[PDB]
Amino acid sequence: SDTSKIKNRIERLRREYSSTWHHDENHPYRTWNYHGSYEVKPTGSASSLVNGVVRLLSKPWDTITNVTTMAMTDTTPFGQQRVFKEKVDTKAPEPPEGVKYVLNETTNWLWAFLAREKRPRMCSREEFIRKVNSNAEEQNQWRSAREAVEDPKFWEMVDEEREAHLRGECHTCIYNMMGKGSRAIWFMWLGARFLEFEALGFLNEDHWLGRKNSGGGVEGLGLQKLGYILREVGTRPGGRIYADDTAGWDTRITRADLENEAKVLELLDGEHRRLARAIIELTYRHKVVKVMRPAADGRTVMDVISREDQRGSGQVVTYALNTFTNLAVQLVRMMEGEGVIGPDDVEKLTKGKGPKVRTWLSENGEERLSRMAVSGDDCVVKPLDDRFATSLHFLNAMSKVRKDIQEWKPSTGWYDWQQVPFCSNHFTELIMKDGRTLVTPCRGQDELVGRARISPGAGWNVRDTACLAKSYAQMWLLLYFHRRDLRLMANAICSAVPVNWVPTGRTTWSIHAGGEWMTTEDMLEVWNRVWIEENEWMEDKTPVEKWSDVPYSGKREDIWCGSLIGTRARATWAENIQVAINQVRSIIGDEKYVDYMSSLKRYEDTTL
Ligand SMILES: [Mg+2]
Ligand SMILES: [Zn+2]
């Protein structure tokens, strides 16, 4: 029985596409809420756009049914529909009273702990423009945003919608962006992004989930640190190291989870609180999504639907909230594992022990938090003992059902942290020529090159494509330098792309903190700065003076993670790449290029 906080939106939409507005009676939506549609052109890209640079400089990976399949997506109104006709439904049942009580206490203690030192604040339009002028949003039309911010007409709209919220109403926030001319629709998706940043941006801008403030979080830490954090955690005495995943986390978030997240509001006052409340209850709990769909008579239409008690939006606020909730979830599971609560307390908390839960949170919460590494729905926990493996009563009752395992089958962990996966990566200890040890991230090489082969917008803008390829290359040199193929392929890209071109585009995926590779500065210089100078786990600060001195994985670890070394296809590519490099050059044109290759061929380890 809901459709009120949304009425405002559907209206502002109906009176713009009114010349097109209409009801379909063919809407396939029975899970979402159909509100009508309007005629629109079909923007749905045929399928996938390849990065011509990364692609030409990786011929062997042409025929790898693991990097290929990862590229072709369906942006067409047809694909947008097929996808939308598969999404999960298994409406996470609200937790029982006993579970709801423990979660309430836990989340009460957590919010208090996070707010112990820092004070919430509103983020300015200046911070916005600055986070906009760098940081990322999802493509290279990100310059359209850098421009929209300089336009007084975009902020005029923001002023109108901001005033609208201070009274508890939403008009132009729809987290979907599709469609003298007008760019209003764009000024709105972005506007909603600002209003949200202004109201709840402090969580991330002030690092409320950084390890220091959250104890278990890792916000702001790049891959150069995550490895060392895993080691530190995977060393506190106790049971094995557990790293369970929730099956479809986003769909397992309950109204109870949403209520607990919404407790931030109690931390705020006056205008800030009112602005934040409009975000939480208008733009988060009530979603307004747009979707293209092929209608009758070959005409395409934009369907305007909505959902109740939805996840949220603005993947930066989302990340903070997901981290918060997961931290709470793990604390509860630990409580059970330690025998503070059990199967008898699930339905109704027992034998007068609510004070025991508050005592445990009070005296153990902080230490317990330091035994976790939580990044959104991803986590690593080292409990006091292995009773954690069977501590599944509250976990399952919270709808946080583990992925790839029977509901009541105890979890399995490890002893050696050197193999625990975290943030789509397995962190390894690497011994350099000079005896020193690094802790580096590894992950399947097929996914690494597969992602680099992907590019936004039907690449007509070479500069962007080459610049994106360069960020991937330099990202690899910084994080995946130990992988033989990536080091070689990276240097090829850097040799084929003009030296003066600044790397642009998105490389940071899944993870977020990072971006050090987005420079025109020498990569050995930045490698030195992040792996030695600024590495608080690096005792000896003596710099490395050559790439040959920067270690590789063991020939065995390189393959463990998908190396093509030892293969003929890769033998033929490593030896005659200068041709492809030249080909790229000729195509991109007459520019200044530097050769990072030859210096590499000097330390080429081949055929075993
Ligand atoms: Mg995990
Ligand atoms: Zn709004």
The DSSP string of 205-234 is HTTTTSHHHHSSB-TT--HHHHHHHHHHHT
CA of 417 to the centre of ligand 1 (A): 13
- The answer to whether 1-43+77-90+171-178+285-308 and 123-170+179-200 have equal CATH topology is no
CATH dotted code for 1-43+77-90+171-178+285-308: 3.30.70.2840
The packing angle between helices 152-165 and 270-278, to 10°, is 100
50/59 Cα distance (integer angstroms) = 13
3-state secondary structure of 107: helix
Rg (the chain; Cα; Å): 26
Is 512 assigned a ligand-binding role in the annotation? no
Token output for 443:
């992950």
> What is the distance in A from the centroid of ligand 1 to the CA of 399?
17
Q: Are 12 and 6 in contact (CB under 8 A)?
A: no
Dihedral class, residue 558 (left if φ above 0, else alpha if ψ from -120 to 50, else beta): alpha
Q: How far is the CA of 14 from the centre of ligand 2 (A)?
A: 17
Task: Give the C-alpha separation, 302 to 179, whole Å.
Answer: 9
What element of type H or E holds 191? helix 184-200
Going through 166-322 in order, the beta strands assigned E by DSSP cover 286-294, 300-308
Coil, strand or helix: which one is 352? coil
Helix 354-369 with 97-114: angle, nearest 10 deg: 50
173 is in an annotated binding site: yes
Residues 218, 357, 219: CA angle, nearest 5 degrees: 5
Note whether 161 and 195 are within 8 A (CB): yes
Helix axes 462-479, 484-496, angle to 10 degrees: 150
CA separation for the pair 269, 279 (Å, rounded): 15
CB 311 within 8 A of CB 377: no
Question: Cβ(194)–Cβ(349) under 8 Å?
Answer: no
Report how far residue 46's alpha carbon sits from residue 39's, in angstroms, rounded to the nearest whole number.
20
Find residue 37's DSSP bridge partners: 22, 303
Q: Which of 515, 551, 518 is nearest to 532 (CA)?
A: 551
User: Ligand 2 center to residue 289 CA distance, Å?
Assistant: 14
Q: Are 566 and 559 in contact (CB under 8 A)?
A: yes
- Ligand nearest the Cα of residue 192 is 2
Distances 349 to 99, 169, 343, 359, 458 between C-alpha atoms, Å:
8, 39, 10, 15, 58
Measured at the CA of 436, the angle between CA 431 and CA 442, to 5 degrees, comes to 40
Closest ligand to the CA of 373 = 1
Q: If we measure between CA atoms, which residue out of 547, 530, 556 comes closest to residue 601?
A: 547
In angstroms, the Cα distances linking 542 to 433, 435, 476 are 13, 12, 23
What is the distance in A from the centroid of ligand 1 to the CA of 425? 10
DSSP 136-168: ---SSTHHHHHHHTT-HHHHHHHHHHHHHHTTT
Give 122 Cα–ligand 1 centroid separation in angstroms.
33
Burial of 16 (0-12, 13-18, 19+ CB in 10 A): middle
- Counting every residue written for the chain, the total comes to 608
Q: Is 494 annotated as a binding residue?
A: no
Domain ranges for the chain: 1-43+77-90+171-178+285-308, 44-76+424-608, 91-122+201-284+309-423, 123-170+179-200
- Contact residues for 464 (Cβ-Cβ < 8 A; gap 6+): 140, 455, 457, 504, 505
Residue pair 131/197 in contact (Cβ under 8 Å)? The answer is yes
Q: Max CA-CA distance within the chain? A: 79
423: annotated binding-site residue? Answer: no
Tell me the C-alpha distance between 329 and 312, whole Å. 19
Asked whether 57 and 496 are in contact (CB, 8 A), the reply is yes
Q: 431 C-alpha vs ligand 1 centroid, how far in Å?
A: 26
Q: What whole-number distance in Å separates Cα of residue 426 and Cα of residue 446?
A: 15
Question: Locate tokens 């399949």: which residue?
Answer: 69
Give the ligand at the shortest distance from the Cα of 278.
2
Measured at the CA of 198, the angle between CA 195 and CA 201, to 5 degrees, comes to 120
* Fold (topology level) of 123-170+179-200: 434 Repressor (Amino-terminal Domain) (1.10.260)
Query: In 453-530, which ranges are continuous DSSP H helix?
Result: 462-479, 484-496, 523-528
Q: Give residue 169 CA to ligand 2 midpoint distance, Å.
A: 7
Q: How far apart (Å, rounded) are the C-alpha atoms in residues 608 and 589?
A: 38
Question: Which of 583, 504, 31, 561 is CA-nearest to residue 289?
Answer: 31
Residue 243 Cα to ligand 1 midpoint, Å, equals 4
| CA-to-CA dists, residue 7 to 170, 278, 282, 372, angstroms | 9, 15, 11, 43
- Determination approach: X-ray
| CA–centroid distance, residue 423 to ligand 1 (Å) | 7
Side chain identity at 603, as an amino acid letter?
A: Y
How many angstroms separate the alpha carbon of residue 294 from the centre of ligand 2?
29
Instruction: Quote the tokens at residue 32.
Output: 């979402």
The bound ligand whose nearest atom lies closest to the alpha carbon of 375 is: 1
CA dihedral for 283, 284, 285, 289, sign (positive or negative)? positive
Give 606's Cβ-side CA count (13 Å radius).
12
* Resolution of the model in angstroms: 3.0
Nearest by Cα to 595 from 467, 495, 487: 495
d(CA 442, CA 419): 10
On whether 35 is known to bind a ligand per the annotation, the reply is no
- Enter the tokens of residue 182: 């007008």
Backbone angles phi, psi at 440, to 5 degrees: -115, 155
